[PDB]
Amino acid sequence: HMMTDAKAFRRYIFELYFDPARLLELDDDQHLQRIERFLDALAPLHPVLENWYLCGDSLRDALSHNVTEHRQDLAKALSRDRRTRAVELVLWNGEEDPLKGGLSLDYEASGRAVSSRLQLEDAGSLLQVFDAPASSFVAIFLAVLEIWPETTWGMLAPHAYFVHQRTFPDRRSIGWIGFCPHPLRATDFPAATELVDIPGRGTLLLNGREPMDETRREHFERVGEADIKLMELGYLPPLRG
Ligand code: NA
User: Fold this and answer.
1) Centre of ligand 1 from the C-alpha of residue 171, in Å
2) Of 142, 127, 153, which Cα lies nearest the Cα of 210?
3) Which residue of 13, 32, 89, 218 has the lowest C-beta tally within 10 Å?
4) For residue 35, is it left (φ>0), alpha (ψ between -120 and 50) or beta?
5) 23 by DSSP, 3-state: which?
6) 57 CB contacts (<8 Å, ≥6 apart)?
7) Where in this chain does the record put each Immunity protein domain (predicted)?
């Protein structure tokens, strides 16, 4: 079918991974500059992405420091979020309700893979508000690739799919939309899969969303067949790493 199931909210995972050695080379000024550029790139995509704030305890405190208004506040996020062995930065977009596009951002750079990453949670909130979600999510990937040439993997996937349906237990997944840092040939992939070639970076892959009804071939062809081809190419990275 062309439509999805009818559900009030779907949890998603949205994670971009960076080469830890190359990311660690950056100093704080460069991390802050990249985050500033990334927030700038989010702003045109939807009204809920236009404002970002430091976290706080009272609602008044958590809305007092708009880092898209006062960019010096971004350093104050780094100051309270930093830890001895890693830069970390946490922001929220000022919307408390996930059903209204509420979102937080978590950026870490440690020199290790697990904590050299950009996460948007819960990205299912953006599926709530995007009029044309496929292209808007691709635009978020495109921003990350332009700002972080160190990107080594990206995945946007339903949480339940990743946890309970990913083909390879000890590997990452390309998800519904994802980034693989290699050129790919449409020949090797299903017809429902769209490949966006990004010279100098790799490929963005768009599989189809989960429909209300689908056959066994269609089920296999969705995210599973793409993960299988990536694994067969040696491009699907291990989870532990
Ligand atoms: Na203020």
Assistant:
1) 44
2) 127
3) 218
4) alpha
5) helix
6) none
7) 32-238
Sign of the CA dihedral with 49 first, then 43, 16, and 27 last: negative
Six-digit token pair at 161? Answer: 């799919």
Question: Residue 110 is encoded by which pair of tokens?
Answer: 């440690």
| Data resolution in angstroms | 1.6
Nearest to 233 by CA among 187, 186, 182: 182
Listing from the earlier edge strand, what are the strands of the sheet with 116-121?
87-92, 104-109, 116-121, 12-18, 151-158, 177-180, 202-206, 194-198
Q: Cα of 66 to ligand 1 centre, how many Å?
A: 7
Residue carrying the six token digits 């970002």: 52
Among 71, 65, 90, smallest CA distance to 80 is for 90
Rg (alpha carbons) of the chain, rounded to whole number:
18
